[PDB]
């Protein structure tokens, strides 16, 4: 097998900046070869695209700014100037001797400016009460960088059981995440406890961004 | 132009077995080698193996650890791609591609994906919640509302709101999998003034229990 190792994993860059994305092959035996390179752009609930075919020909609709190169084994994918719509993740591909194989993949970060989410809480709604369980939502959405913190306080105490987090891909338009947290309790303890709070740690703030609501207000 | 339209996916049982198509149309389907790639949740992709032209005897071919169980098929004279897997494995979940081999190998046009899970868990309907503000909640200019998808099998639901007319400030989030059940959650950000206002509804869909709710986002009262 020409076994394909891509590197790097992930890297970040900023708008207009220049991103590279490398792609190494293991070489095989028979004279009647003739293998190929071919890259791939896959963004979030999508099918890949293809960019570029055999190493550095550029594929008709893909703009100006992909560029393939490389000899041998190494093999290369140039991304300039970045644009917010390329945060996605890039695969190499070998086309020739048998299997087909692609390489392990590389998600590229948009940098953009630090922001702060926007996060609001949600009680539970009054039909999941009426079949014994209740869920409190949580909804950090619209920030970066992807790193991001969620405390459950249920009264004065804080509170690690049935905590369910979700978080999305870069946004394609702007360059932000967002971020669901689910707390689920029974019925009971939901009723035998009053205040509920959702705290949001996060870069762009010292302090972390608190909602809450208290259980008396239906 | 070229279309590749897939269709088949769903939950199956271990050991069991699935046919998967994929339609072709805006070019002479009988001249392309054609190809099945599968993609596990959060992760590579992975070659399954391609069928040849009827100048090449519907040469067939696949990657070593299917290559006993899976079957690529051609239907020229109807443009259509077949890929039946037998004996299922548990790994065997993935997203499933099919491709037309374009210029160098290279893969210039795919299906949009059709979702093949194997578990011996049960197809479940979701319970849809609203997830409205507090009542004791106060103003800021533009409002929050979501909805909670909750106990489901298998992936997918679709999620949209007002039957596609808030397209907007809309975070459907990826599912997660507890105890073989996935919980599932979208949030819509609207101008304040529009809601309560206005109506706001958010419409699920799981095709697997032919589940069909739709919820709209009500105030809050005593």
């Known amino acids: 097998d020409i076994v394909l190792t891509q590197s790097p994993a992930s890297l970040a860059v900023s708008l207009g900046q220049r991103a590279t994305i490398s792609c190494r092959a293991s070489?095989?035996?028979?004279?009647?070869?003739?293998?190929?390179f071919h890259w791939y752009q896959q963004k979030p609930g999508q099918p890949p695209k293809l960019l570029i075919y055999?190493?550095?020909n550029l594929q008709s609709g893909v703009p100006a700014r992909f560029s393939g190169s490389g000899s041998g084994t190494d093999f290369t994918l140039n991304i300039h100037p970045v644009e917010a719509e390329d945060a996605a993740t890039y695969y190499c591909?070998?086309?020739?001797?048998?299997?087909?194989?692609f390489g392990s993949g590389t998600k590229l970060e948009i940098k953009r400016a630090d922001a702060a989410p926007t996060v609001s809480i949600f009680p539970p709604s009054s039909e999941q009460l009426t079949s014994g369980g209740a869920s409190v939502v949580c909804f950090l959405n619209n920030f970066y960088p992807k790193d991001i913190n969620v405390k459950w306080k249920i009264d004065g105490s804080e509170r690690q059981n049935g905590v369910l987090n979700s978080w999305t891909d870069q946004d394609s338009k702007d360059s932000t995440y967002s971020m669901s947290s689910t707390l689920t309790l029974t019925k009971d303890e939901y009723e035998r406890h009053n205040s509920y709070t959702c705290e949001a740690t996060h870069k762009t703030s010292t302090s972390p961004i608190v909602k809450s609501f208290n259980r008396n207000e239906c | 132009e070229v279309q590749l339209v897939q269709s088949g996916g769903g939950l199956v049982q271990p050991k069991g077995s699935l046919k998967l198509s994929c339609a072709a149309s805006?070019?002479?389907?009988?001249?392309?080698?054609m190809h099945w790639v599968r993609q596990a949740p959060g992760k590579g992709l992975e070659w399954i193996g391609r069928?040849?032209?009827?100048?090449?005897?519907?040469?067939?071919d696949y990657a070593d650890p299917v290559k006993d169980r899976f079957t690529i098929s051609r239907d020229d004279s109807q443009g259509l791609l077949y890929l039946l897997m037998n004996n299922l494995k548990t790994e065997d979940t993935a997203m499933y591609y099919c491709?037309?081999?374009?210029?160098?190998?290279?893969?210039?046009?795919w299906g949009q994906g059709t979702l093949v899970t194997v578990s011996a868990a049960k197809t479940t309907p979701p319970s849809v919640y609203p997830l409205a503000p507090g009542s004791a909640a106060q103003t800021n200019s533009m409002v929050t509302l979501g909805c909670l998808v909750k106990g489901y099998f298998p992936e997918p639901v679709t999620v949209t709101w007002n039957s596609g007319s808030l397209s907007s400030g809309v975070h459907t989030f990826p599912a997660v999998l507890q105890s073989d059940l996935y919980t599932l959650s979208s949030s819509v950000t609207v101008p304040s003034s529009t809601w309560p206002s206005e109506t706001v509804t958010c419409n699920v869909a799981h095709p697997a229990s032919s589940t069909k709710v739709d919820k709209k986002i009500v105030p809050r009262d005593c």
């Open positions: 491709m037309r081999e374009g210029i160098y190998g290279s893969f210039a046009y």
């Open positions: 805006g070019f002479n389907f009988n001249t392309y080698a």
């Open positions: 069928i040849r032209s009827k100048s090449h005897n519907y040469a067939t």
């Open positions: 070489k095989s035996v028979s004279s009647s070869a003739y293998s190929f």
């Open positions: 055999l190493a550095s």
């Open positions: 591909q070998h086309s020739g001797e048998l299997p087909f194989t």
